[PDB]
Amino acid sequence: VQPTPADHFTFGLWTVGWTGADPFGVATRKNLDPVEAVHKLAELGAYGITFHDNDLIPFDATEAEREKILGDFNQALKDTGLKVPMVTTNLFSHPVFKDGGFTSNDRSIRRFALAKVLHNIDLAAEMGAETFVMWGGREGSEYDGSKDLAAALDRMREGVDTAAGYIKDKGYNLRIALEPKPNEPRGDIFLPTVGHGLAFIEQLEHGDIVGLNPETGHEQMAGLNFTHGIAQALWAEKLFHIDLNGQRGIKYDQDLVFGHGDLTSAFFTVDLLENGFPNGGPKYTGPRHFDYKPSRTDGYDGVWDSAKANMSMYLLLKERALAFRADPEVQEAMKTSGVFELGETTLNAGESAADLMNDSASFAGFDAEAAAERNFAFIRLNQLAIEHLLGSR
Amino acid sequence: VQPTPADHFTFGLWTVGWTGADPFGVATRKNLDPVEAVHKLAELGAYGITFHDNDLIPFDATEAEREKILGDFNQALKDTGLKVPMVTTNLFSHPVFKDGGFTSNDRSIRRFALAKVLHNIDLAAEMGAETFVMWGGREGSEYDGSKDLAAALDRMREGVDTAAGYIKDKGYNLRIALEPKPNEPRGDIFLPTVGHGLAFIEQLEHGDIVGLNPETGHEQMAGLNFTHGIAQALWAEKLFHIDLNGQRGIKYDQDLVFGHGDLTSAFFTVDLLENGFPNGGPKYTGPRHFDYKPSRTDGYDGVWDSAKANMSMYLLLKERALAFRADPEVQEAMKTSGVFELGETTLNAGESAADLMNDSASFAGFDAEAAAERNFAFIRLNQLAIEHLLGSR
Amino acid sequence: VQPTPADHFTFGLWTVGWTGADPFGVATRKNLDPVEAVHKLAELGAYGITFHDNDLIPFDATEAEREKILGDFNQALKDTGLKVPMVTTNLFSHPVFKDGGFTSNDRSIRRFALAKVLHNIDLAAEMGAETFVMWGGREGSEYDGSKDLAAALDRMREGVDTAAGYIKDKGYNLRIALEPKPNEPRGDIFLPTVGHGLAFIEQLEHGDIVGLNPETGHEQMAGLNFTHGIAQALWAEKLFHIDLNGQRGIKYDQDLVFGHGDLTSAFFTVDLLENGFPNGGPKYTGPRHFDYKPSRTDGYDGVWDSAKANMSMYLLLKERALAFRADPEVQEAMKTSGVFELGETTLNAGESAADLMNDSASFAGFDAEAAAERNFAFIRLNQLAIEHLLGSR
Amino acid sequence: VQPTPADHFTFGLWTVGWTGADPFGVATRKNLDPVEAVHKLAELGAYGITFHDNDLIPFDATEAEREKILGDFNQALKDTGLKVPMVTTNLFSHPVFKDGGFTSNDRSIRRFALAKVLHNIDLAAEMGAETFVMWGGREGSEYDGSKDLAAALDRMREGVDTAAGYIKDKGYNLRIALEPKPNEPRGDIFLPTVGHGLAFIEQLEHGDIVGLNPETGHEQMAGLNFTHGIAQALWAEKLFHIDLNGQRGIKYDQDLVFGHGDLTSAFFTVDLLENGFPNGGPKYTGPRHFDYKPSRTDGYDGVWDSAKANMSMYLLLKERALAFRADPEVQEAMKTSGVFELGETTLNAGESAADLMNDSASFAGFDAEAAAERNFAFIRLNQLAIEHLLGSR
């Protein structure tokens, strides 16, 4: 497992920089200087860094302060060669955003939130980022009568189309990536899953540059299959970015290291990212980003250790996933289970609906009881998969 | 609570007809004659009945048998005046469908499944049904390598576009309604939630007549907010049908009577169906269908009792939900929380992105700390809602 | 709904004083003075107030500071008449308790957590509290190999039995109540549910004075039936205190107002607290403590509103629950479903196991098919409860 | 992976013989003959076979039939050498147990369920079983007012203590093991987790011979940590038997092959069964029983494949788990994280509660801020386990 910048492993400033405050306690770690994060990450083999506007530039920063911080940060980047592929906006920590940014009930707050986004598109464009992520963490409610739900989607759309229009207008080479989360910090968050994110994009005026940024753990907080969810994003050609982390069930957002949650699911996500679909189709080509948090029990050792562990796990999974598809025994099991058979169209070329109702062999004389005896042998194909994952074969 | 056919309460044949077999035991109730179901339902105040092709016509039925059953069933309908607003296909109980219907890995099975659908579109059209529901219960997997996930969506699309093309072609006044379910009977089901159902429809050639049929309990098995999910379907103008039942958490599909699961969520769904959105927008206008199962502990009493309980609960919720919006105290609390305020566009008419970045009052001189002092008073608006639900006020 | 001090409504200092920082944001409210909490709680109708040592006395407070704080506090108590029924210790906020208090892997942190508990028992005695609550919030792990799981329970026992021997040696009139939680802030918390808590107590040397403190939301984070769990606690005569709140599903601890989560479960929880068991048995007669958090979207008017709403909600449910059991149609429905029949012993007085084996009418001569026809009528019985809850009956 | 009879791999008749009916469909496989199950299990390397009375003897079987069935069965056992380590009773399939066995509201069903249990104890004795398992699958409710919850536990106690007195009076060398399940087939099952099961046993008269039978998937249906739950059972010396399988989340009981659910948890479960506790303590030495279902998509080649896969999976995990603990880098990592340190008593030999209170270096003179700097290094320790599990180390 030796990462290299050709792997395209990206990390957020807030990931290794997470200080350790959770809702039951305060920080266990001192703040991390952004110059050091950049240097350290570059020596680990990372390809780039990502930040929320306020991870770097304090909310209340004066202009002299802002310029100093960017000079320092631009210095570090020049020095190490790290790229800045994604930039996002913090529309959830200041008290002003307690009801949302884009979908706040207070109209003045909505205006400030959108203004804040627009300024950050400029920053992102100047840093050379290709993706602009939107995570609407405070968009939602605890109680069902708190919102007009139709107006909430209208407001949402208005903010996202305004940002997309501005990108088009300014000539910037950026795409927006929506990032779904079912709950936390709100009781219910708007556009809860990958499916709801895809759906909403189809109702936008400038939806052509608006896509998804799915996060492992987020999908798993509604108990969904991450791999199935990104497969649908990919099939719609909307998988613009990916956030990899780990979660161990339906509960608070854990943000563990990728592979430290549901392991078999992590193996099949790697397989999908690396091998694509068995019958061919689109392949994911962007950065492999890690939006995790080093457990608060661990000191600064642990922070670089956990950063190292993300890349190790991905690499270890990749090696196994490549060995798995290369295996001749796995290819035969795949043919036997009908994996390649699923890729053949149901209908024969130029055969219509009426033509099919009409074929006797297809319905009226179809031997249903005889077709039902097929042994799909999915258990054995899963056993082969697990034995490659364990490095048994 | 006195239902009347003007309420548009519909029930499936398989709902009151559910015999009681679950995966740990056999039936506790004798089979229900479809003629009696129709008569009984008509005396309760139901508006119509719905069935799966095989709920009525046995899989192996000869043609003389098929004609007899339809004559009996058409007799009963003529006699009672009951309508048949929705018809669906059973693509999950016979052993042939163990891997799916439309997305089975075996191509011959896919062909039979689609042929079976096409024949059932004819039946539906002859019964005067307006909606054709598709529930893909066996479309999915237990194991991640069992399917090419892209090919599975291609196959799915091919089956649904073929059915839609056939409706268009035949001149039938029917619309397809996809019905999402996260899991059970498979480990993971394709198009798990309302969001995934909406998304998939946008990738179809004939998506204009393809919409959703969300079920209360299905959304709640992924822990989502039913009311938020149908609000998005409504906003996209894709809420073609609705299945009401109850569920008490993330676990097996319980199918309890509507209102016998999450009660406050049942109240806000009724409010949405009855009152629409606070600021106006689309309103749901079809049948209120109940896809529940009378608990197996209860005898034939209980079966009509539980059918009666569905309509009672809906009516009782409706009365409370109407009282709630009519209340002057509730309207003031609503104004105070910014519910109507959310309906105002963020931007002023003909104000662009650049115009907003540029307004000083919106960003550079916006007093964030002062805007953050607003008391949204969402707890009190929720207390008013609950006190109307309990018939306290 | 007019709460009075014999209702035994007690509130934590940390509930109304919760300022609003969650894991994605900053406090939204100004700190609340302890003297001002006592005055407000007492005016609203509360009977008592509870606290965590560090809620009242800063962790850093000098001895001088300690004594000053306790004088104003005791003065307010004296001026208002509020009791202090339960006191608890903070073994979770300071960075030192990052791997736990009693089960920390570091031996010198275990002794410091235990010494902090012992000093807090002297303060509990001093304030006249009858219950000392233990929430082991940091006792657990993110990863399975972090702990020797046998040792962790041995260290948990050592702490609780040391503390209990100290009560007994000092002759304080005080009981220990453990408070289970499945997760958050740890991935997995030890003694995660009522059941684990009850079992663990049977392994203690001093178990006689150790009981439970179940919290609504906590059991509902594992998808358990809170009425059923507190019924089991009560049946073992181990329900020493109770914490009431709201939770809308399997997700982060929400701490809503009691009744703003699962409404029907809250109804049945109030029925067990107030009415006890249909056939007679134990009754819980301690205080009704509200361990919740005023939503961060709301100002101080919401804070006092939310405190008032907990009380209101319990009183509305109480009156509906009393009306429900008093109702003769409900009592007949109960009779029909066999609620009273379950109260009869299975064996006749003096019947041995050998006797029943050998009794031909209970096995050999048993008509199982006839017995299976019984209509338990559980659906009609549930419909009667909801109708009563909706104030329709 | 070459399983042999000293591995103590036992299998239920109902697992491989599970024909495939779920709640949405019909059996997909032909019945499996009991004599043929014994021959196949024995050839594959199993050590024993287990059954439910009705798995082997039809509920209707005449006495003539009974004796015939038991002769071919005993003959196969004799020919193969397979033991019969555990026997259980079916108190869930026949319509008569629709409201339970031992806790049915109907008194004559309670006596019939108890008499069926007593007769089954004579058969258990007769086959040389050491454990009699009790799964109370129908003991529970859909609705909260269906039962008097105190009475239900009293009726559950009566049944288990009657049965245990019968063992003791007859001097059978047999222990009772209760098997918890949170839900399915009931909405809420009584004694839903390891914890509730352990607590309930402490209320019995004959508790000394009553223990638990935890099942992987069952605790994982409430989102609990299975290693942590069986650790608590083991710590109380109550782990009498164990049922191993796979579950991918909070949903319907899947009964996958052991290792095809949560892989990292299975790894740590094998470590506790085989290796026990890091600091020494109790060890479980009973049989490793596989209570799972061969996926319905597969034919008989899948059935024998799946039985083989359970064994393989346990043996691959066993070898990786042994390699993992033997590894000196892992032993040093363990030392660094304080795994061995937790094994030391908090108090010094002879130290009283008063002593520690009064010891200035454990409280007053404690540097909490210094103690909080410790790097527990739990993330690196988890990375070492996964690397070992992936056969990388």
Instruction: For residue B303, give Cα distances in angstroms to B17, B258, B310, C252, D147.
Output: 8, 14, 11, 38, 20
- What element of type H or E holds D264? helix D263-275
CATH superfamily of the D1-393 domain = Divalent-metal-dependent TIM barrel enzymes (3.20.20.150)
Q: Give the HSE-up count for residue C70: Cα atoms under 13 Å, Cβ half-sphere.
A: 14
Looking at the DSSP bridge assignments, the partners of residue D49 are D11
Which residue in B105, B106, B110 has the most chain A C-beta atoms within 10 A of its own C-beta, making it the best mutation to test that interface? Answer: B105
Tell me which DSSP letter residue D188 carries.
E
| Separation between Cα atoms, residue A107 and residue A313, nearest integer Å | 45
C-alpha B224/C-alpha A193 separation (Å) is 10
- Determined by X-ray
Check if the beta carbon of residue B247 is closer than 8 Å to that of residue B258: no
Closest by Cα among D277, D329, D382, C26 to A297 = D382
Q: Which residues, listed in sequence order, are joined to residue D133 by a DSSP beta bridge?
A: D88, D177
Residue D188 with chain B: CB contacts under 8 Å: 248
C198: phi then psi, degrees, rounded to nearest 5: -60, -45
Round to whole Å and give the CA distance between D87 and D91.
13
Decide if A274 contacts A315 (C-beta within 8 A): no
Provide the b/e sequence for B296-330 (b: ≥16 CB within 10 Å).
bbbbeebbebbbbbbbbbbbbbbbbbeebbebeeb
Q: Which amino acid is at A72?
A: D
Cβ contact B363:A115 at 8 Å: yes
Strand partners, A211: A177
Query: Between A144, A158, A182, which is nearest B224 by CB?
Result: A182
Cis omega (within 30 of 0) for bond into D185: yes
Query: Angle A263-275/A378-389 helices, nearest 10 degrees?
Result: 90
What counts of helices (H) and strands (E) characterise chain A? 15, 10
* Backbone phi and psi for residue B37, each to the nearest 5 degrees, phi listed first: -60, -55
Q: Hey, which residues does D88 pair with through a beta bridge?
A: D52, D133
Q: Does C91 touch chain A (CB under 8 A)?
A: no
What crossing angle do the helices spanning A226-235 and B149-170 adopt, rounded to 10°?
Answer: 60
Whether the CB-CB separation of A79 and A128 falls below 8 Å is answered with no
D195, C197: Cβ pair inside 8 Å?
yes
Q: What are the tokens at A219?
A: 């999908």
Cβ atoms < 10 Å from Cβ of B169: 11
Q: Is C130 annotated in some ligand binding site? A: no
Q: Is A108 left (phi over 0), alpha (psi -120 to 50) or beta?
A: alpha
Phi then psi for residue B223, to 5 deg, are 70, 30
Cα angle value D54/D57/D58 (rounded, 5°): 75
Joined tokens for residue C321: 């629950």
Question: Does B360 touch chain C if contact means CB atoms closer than 8 Å?
Answer: no
Instruction: Please answer yes or no on whether D386 and A259 come within 8 Å at the CB atom.
Output: yes
Question: Beta partners for A178?
Answer: A134, A212
Secondary structure (3-state) at A277: coil
> Please, are residues A88 and A52 in contact by the beta-carbon 8 Å criterion?
yes
Per-residue three-class SS string for chain C: CCCCCCCCEEEEHHHHCCCCCECCECCCCCCCCHHHHHHHHHHHCCCEEEEEHHHHCCCCCCHHHHHHHHHHHHHHHHHHCCECCEEECCCCCCHHHECECCCCCCHHHHHHHHHHHHHHHHHHHHCCCCEEEEECCCCEECCHHHCCHHHHHHHHHHHHHHHHHHHHHHCCCCEEEEECCCCCCCCEECCCCHHHHHHHHCCCCCHHHEEECCEHHHHHCCCCCHHHHHHHHHHCCCECCCEECECCCCCCCCCECCCCCCHHHHHHHHHHHHHCCCCCCCCCCCCEEECCCCCCCCCHHHHHHHHHHHHHHHHHHHHHHHHHHHCHHHHHHHHHCCCCHHHCCCCCCCCCHHHHHCCHHHCCCCCHHHHCCCCCCHHHHHHHHHHHHCCCC
Buried b / exposed e over C221-260, threshold 16 CB at 10 Å, is bbbbbbbbbbbbbbbbebbbbbbbbbbbbbbbbbbbbbbb
Tell me how far the alpha carbon of residue D322 is from its chain's centroid.
Answer: 22
- Do D19 and D29 meet the contact criterion of CB atoms below 8 Å apart? yes
**Cα dihedral C316/C319/C320/C324 (nearest 10):** 170
Q: Which residues contact B152 (CB under 8 A, 6 or more apart)?
A: A342, B103, B139, B190
State how far the Cα of B346 lies from the Cα of A113, in Å rounded to an integer: 10
Query: Which residue has 């937790």 as its token pair?
Result: D342
Token pair for residue B204?
Answer: 């179809």
Decide: helix, strand or coil at residue A59: coil
DSSP D372: T
A302 vs D28, D306, D380: nearest CB: D380
Query: Residue C35's CB: how many other CB atoms inside 10 A?
Result: 16
CB atoms within 10 A of CB C2: 8
Chain B residue with minimum CA distance to C368: B28
Helix-helix angle D226-235:D263-275, to 10 degrees: 20
Q: Which of B7, B33, B39, B52 is catalytic?
A: B52
Burial of D78 (0-12, 13-18, 19+ CB in 10 A): exposed
B55 is a catalytic site residue: yes
What residues contact D335, with CB distance under 8 A and at least 6 apart?
none
* Torsion sign over Cα B138, B143, B146, B152: positive
Residue written as token pair 């997309």: A164
A185 preceded by a cis bond (ω within 30 of 0): yes
Q: Would the annotation count A243 as a binding residue?
A: yes
- CB proximity under 8 Å: C 193-252 to D: 193-200, 202-203, 221-225, 227-229, 231-232, 234-236, 250
User: What tokens were used for B56?
Assistant: 């009525």
According to DSSP, the residues that pair with D132 across neighbouring strands are D87, D176
Closest CA to A180 of A144, A226, A231: A226
Q: In this structure, what token pair is assigned to residue C344? A: 């009869």
**According to the annotation, is C179 in a ligand binding site?**
yes
CB C170 within 8 A of CB D353: no
Q: How far apart are CA C11 and CA B204, in angstroms?
A: 56
Provide the 10 A C-beta neighbour count for residue A20.
18
B347 touches chain C (CB under 8 A): no
CB contact under 8 A, B193 and A190: no
| Cβ contacts of C374 on chain D, cutoff 8 Å | 106
Do residues A299 and D373 lie in contact, with contact meaning Cβ atoms separated by under 8 Å? yes
Residue D280 contacts by C-beta under 8 Å, 6 or more apart in sequence?
Answer: D343
Tokens 């101080």 correspond to what residue?
A: C300
- Number of CB atoms found within 10 A of residue A68's CB: 12
- Beta carbons of C196 and C205 less than 8 angstroms apart: no
The number of beta carbons lying within 10 Å of the beta carbon of residue C27 is 13
The pair of three-digit structure tokens given for residue D66, joined into one six-digit string: 């009974």
Give the residue among B82, B155, C378, D24 at the shortest CA–CA distance from A281: B155
For residue C264, the chain B residues in CB contact (below 8 A) are: 260, 263
d(CA D164, CA C213): 32
Do residues A124 and A326 lie in contact, with contact meaning Cβ atoms separated by under 8 Å? no
Question: D277, C148: Cβ pair inside 8 Å?
Answer: yes
**Any idea how long chain A is?**
393
C-beta atoms surrounding B36 within 10 Å: 12
Question: Could you tell me which of A297, A296, A339, A292 has the C-alpha nearest to residue A313?
Answer: A292
Task: Please judge whether D272 and C149 are an interchain contact, meaning their C-beta atoms are less than 8 angstroms apart.
Answer: yes
C187 HSE (CA, 13 A, CB side): 22
Buried b or exposed e, range D144-167, using 16+ CB within 10 angstroms: bbbbbbbbbbbbbbbbbbbbbebb
Q: How many CB atoms lie within 10 A of CB A28?
A: 23
Three-state secondary structure call for residue B25:
strand
| Opening angle at CA D253, ends C382 and C141, nearest 5 | 100
Spatial distance between the Cα atoms of B119 and B71, rounded to a whole number of angstroms: 18
D295 interfaces chain A, CB cutoff of 8 Å: yes
Establish whether the linkage from the previous residue to C185 is cis, with ω within 30° of 0. Answer: yes
Neighbouring chains of C at 3+ CB pairs under 8 Å are A, B, D
The catalytic position among D53, D55, D262, D271 is D55
Q: Which of residues 326 through 345 in chain B touch A, CB cutoff 8 A?
A: 334, 337-345
Buried b / exposed e across D341-366, counting CB within 10 Å, b at 16+?
A: bbbeebbeeeeebeebbebeebbeeb
Is the CB of A19 inside 8 Å of chain D's CB atoms? no
Is the CB of residue D260 less than 8 Å from the CB of residue A265? no
Rounded Cα–Cα distance for residues B373 and C298 (Å): 9
d(CA D146, CA B331): 39
Quick one: residue D204, left, alpha or beta (phi over 0 = left, psi -120 to 50 = alpha)? beta
Separation of alpha carbons D88 and C242, rounded Å: 38
Residue B224 — φ and ψ, nearest 5°?
Answer: -90, 165
Q: Which residues contact B273 (CB under 8 A, 6 or more apart)?
A: B242, B284, B288
Q: Which residues make beta-bridge pairs with D50?
A: D12
Largest CA distance in chain D: 81
Alpha helices by DSSP H, listed for chain B, are: 13-16, 34-44, 53-56, 63-80, 107-126, 149-170, 194-201, 216-220, 226-235, 263-275, 300-326, 328-336, 353-358, 368-371, 378-389
Residue C137: C-alpha distances to residues B184, B326, C108, C191, D232 (Å): 35, 45, 19, 10, 18
Residue appearing with tokens 């306020």: A54
Q: How far is CA B190 from CA B108, B139, B153, B185, in A?
A: 20, 6, 8, 12
- CA–chain centroid gap for A137, Å, is 14
- Give dist(CA C107, CA C153) in Å, integer: 15
**Secondary element (H or E) of residue D10:** strand D9-12
CB contact, 8 Å: B299 with chain D?
no
CA distance C66 to chain A (A): 22
Q: Name the amino acid, one letter, at A249.
A: G
CA D63, CA C385: separation in Å to the nearest integer? 47
Instruction: Establish whether the linkage from the previous residue to A23 is cis, with ω within 30° of 0.
Output: no
CA distance B143 to C285: 51
Contact status, residue A196 vs residue B195, Cβ threshold 8 Å: yes
Tokens representing A7? 């792997």
Edge-to-edge strand list for the sheet holding A210-212 = A210-212, A175-178, A131-134, A86-88, A48-52, A9-12, A288-290, A243-244
Instruction: Kindly give the pairing relationship between strand C188-189 and strand C140-141.
Output: antiparallel
Q: What are the φ/ψ torsions at residue B101 (nearest 5 degrees)?
A: -110, -95
Distance CA B277, CA B53 (A): 36
Q: Are D8 and D286 in contact (CB under 8 A)?
A: yes
Q: Are A89 and A116 in contact (CB under 8 A)?
A: yes
Q: Which residue has the tokens 């104004």?
A: B335
Q: Which residue has the tokens 């736990």?
A: C100
Which residues fall within 8 angstroms of residue D122, CB to CB, at 6 or more apart?
Answer: none
Q: Which subunits count as partners of chain D given 3+ CB pairs below 8 Å? A: A, B, C
D234, with CB counted inside 10 A (0-12, 13-18, 19+), is buried
B376/C302 CB distance under 8 A? yes
Contact D356 C118 (CB under 8 A): yes
**Helix, strand, coil percent values for chain D (each to nearest 5):** 50, 10, 40
Please give the C-alpha separations between residue A341 and each of A334, A345, A376, C322, in angstroms, as whole numbers.
Answer: 9, 9, 12, 64
B52 is catalytic: yes
CB D49 within 8 A of CB D93: no
Q: Could you give the residue ranges of the DSSP H alpha helices within B171-254?
A: 194-201, 216-220, 226-235
Q: Which two structure tokens, joined as six digits, stand for B157?
A: 């699309």
CB contact under 8 A, A198 and B196: yes
Tokens 């019968």 locate to: D166
Question: A186 is written with which tokens?
Answer: 């709100």
D386 interfacial to chain C (CB closer than 8 Å): no
* Cα C171 to Cα A87: distance, rounded to the nearest angstrom: 62
Q: What is the stated resolution of the deposited model, in angstroms?
A: 2.3
Say how many residues make up chain D: 393
